[PDB]
């Protein structure tokens, strides 16, 4: 006794965005049951080896994954990927990050024709650069309904300004399971090293000013610096929305540095939202975002989950091969490595499981939506007061893109890590 989204309904949705796995459409119809919501639809994914089993079938979970995630029977009982991701978020991630900042969503039934319609729609509405990317999987019979976190409330009460950050990893591993030649990993961030490789593959116009160790520092000055740095070189780490509409960033990691032209337009798109004179809104806005980030302490709870990566991939990869019952292709072995192989099967499972949960935390994004208060409105939830403009802003913070990482990807994490540290070493 609910509903199926049909071909008729497809006209009510408009393209908002996409990542590697999902398309996101925002609601544009009149029904109050959907105003201020988005729909998340899974892409058809080939050629992804990590999601196939021994026979090349894209099963919900492989036998190895079922064994690894055994402690939640509800998670392994999922009939499809939509149910799997929702139960992962609800049962594994929400206990860790809290229900306040995480929205598991509501599953909705969709017909093939609805999805075939959305397929054609995204083809027309996508930026030209994304036209050959993977479209909607039309064999799935479900999609996900979520609150649009680019909106504070379903409607407008000034405007809503929404800031989306992909913060990446905010800590450095210990030397405990890192080889002597790779020791720079304990002093230079993964993000900073990755920037060098990305620059070499000319995937970016220049090195990002952003340093995730600033964002997660616990220092209010350093948090501000991180925000300022993200404004200057957004790449794919920083976006700003005006009532759900892009006003900064959004062109992938290839997004250009904020030029005077983009800077000028941004300052004006802030008119009315920040009650400050022309040219001054941008500084006050960055201060606003910095204050909300720091004041919420939402990043402290995210850092702890990232810190579930105890051994680093260099250490963790050994536990992985013990799980899948294969001789280790990595082990001139170290004494630290051999002790890990001596660990009980149960603690070896725990380590890898915690590594994968950590990856979710390292690869997710935060959305901070803002609403300008009136002086005739009563006392506020969570808020930030900008003293120089005498303005109070209500804010909400939500974690998005909290996906379950497949077990076989451990191999990819190692390959990539090996490549990043190798390159960064010989560049010194
Ligand atoms: N609940 C939401 N509210 C508003 N915008 C969203 C929401 N979820 C996703 N988006 C937008 O869609 C984009 C891609 O969504 P995401 O779920 O991260 O895709 P993927 O899972 O493929 O990475 C995001 O960068 C964000 O701008
Ligand atoms: Zn080994």
UniProtKB/Swiss-Prot annotation:
Q: Which organism is it from?
A: Arabidopsis thaliana (Mouse-ear cress)
Instruction: Work out whether the entry's keyword set contains Kinase.
Output: yes
Q: Where does motif EXKPK motif map?
A: 164-168
Positions annotated to bind Zn(2+): 318, 328, 331, 341
Going by the UniProt record, its keywords in alphabetical order are:
Acetylation, ATP-binding, Kinase, Metal-binding, Nucleotide-binding, Transferase, Zinc
Assigned protein family: Belongs to the IPK1 type 2 family.
Enumerate the residues binding ATP: 19-22, 40, 147-149, 164-166, 239, 401
Q: Which cofactor does it need?
A: Zn(2+)
Q: Which residues carry this modification: N-acetylmethionine?
A: 1
Q: Does the keyword Kinase apply?
A: yes
What protein does this entry describe? Answer: Inositol-pentakisphosphate 2-kinase
């Amino acid at each position: 006794m609910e509903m199926i989204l049909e071909e008729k309904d497809a006209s009510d949705w408009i393209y908002r965005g996409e990542g590697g796995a999902n398309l996101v459409l925002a609601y544009a119809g009149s029904s109050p049951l959907f105003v201020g919501k988005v729909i998340r639809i899974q892409k058809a994914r080939r050629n992804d080896k990590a999601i196939k089993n021994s026979n090349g079938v894209v099963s919900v979970l492989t036998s190895d994954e079922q064994h690894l995630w055994r402690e939640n029977n509800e998670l392994i009982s999922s009939p499809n990927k939509e149910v799997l991701e929702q139960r992962y978020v609800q049962n594994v991630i929400i206990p860790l990050l809290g229900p306040k900042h995480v929205d598991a969503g509501v599953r909705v039934s969709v017909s093939k024709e609805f999805l075939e319609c959305v397929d054609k729609k995204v083809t027309k509405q996508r930026p030209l650069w994304r036209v050959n990317a993977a479209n909607v999987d039309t064999s799935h019979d479900s999609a996900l309904i979520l609150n649009d976190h680019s909106l504070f409330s379903q409607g407008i009460t000034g405007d809503c300004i929404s800031v989306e950050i992909k913060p990446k990893c905010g800590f450095l591993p210990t030397s405990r399971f890192i080889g002597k030649e790779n020791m720079l990993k304990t002093s230079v961030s993964r993000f900073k090293m990755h920037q060098l490789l990305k620059l070499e593959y000319i995937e970016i116009s220049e090195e990002s000013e952003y340093d995730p160790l600033d964002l997660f520092s616990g220092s209010k000055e350093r948090v501000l610096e991180a925000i300022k740095a993200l404004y200057s070189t957004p790449q794919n780490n920083f976006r700003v929305f005006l009532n759900g509409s892009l006003i900064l960033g959004g062109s992938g990691e290839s997004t250009g540095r904020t030029s005077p032209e983009i800077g000028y337009a941004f300052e004006d798109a802030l008119k009315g939202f920040i009650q400050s004179e022309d040219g001054h809104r941008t500084e006050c806005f960055l201060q606003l975002v910095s204050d909300a980030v720091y004041g919420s302490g939402v990043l402290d709870r995210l850092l702890e989950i990232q810190k579930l990566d105890k051994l680093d991939i260099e250490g963790a990869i050994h536990c992985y091969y013990d799980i899948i019952n294969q001789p280790c292709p990595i082990c001139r072995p170290l004494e630290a490595e051999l002790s890990l192989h001596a660990l009980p099967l149960d603690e070896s499972l725990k380590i890898v499981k915690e590594y994968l949960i950590a990856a979710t935390a390292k690869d997710c994004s935060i959305m901070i939506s803002f609403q300008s208060r009136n002086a005739w409105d009563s006392e506020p939830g969570d808020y930030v007061s900008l003293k120089p403009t005498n303005q109070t802003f209500d804010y909400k913070v939500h974690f998005i893109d909290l996906s379950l990482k497949p077990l076989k990807r451990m191999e990819s994490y190692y390959k990539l890590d090996k490549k990043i540290i190798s390159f960064y070493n010989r560049k010194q």
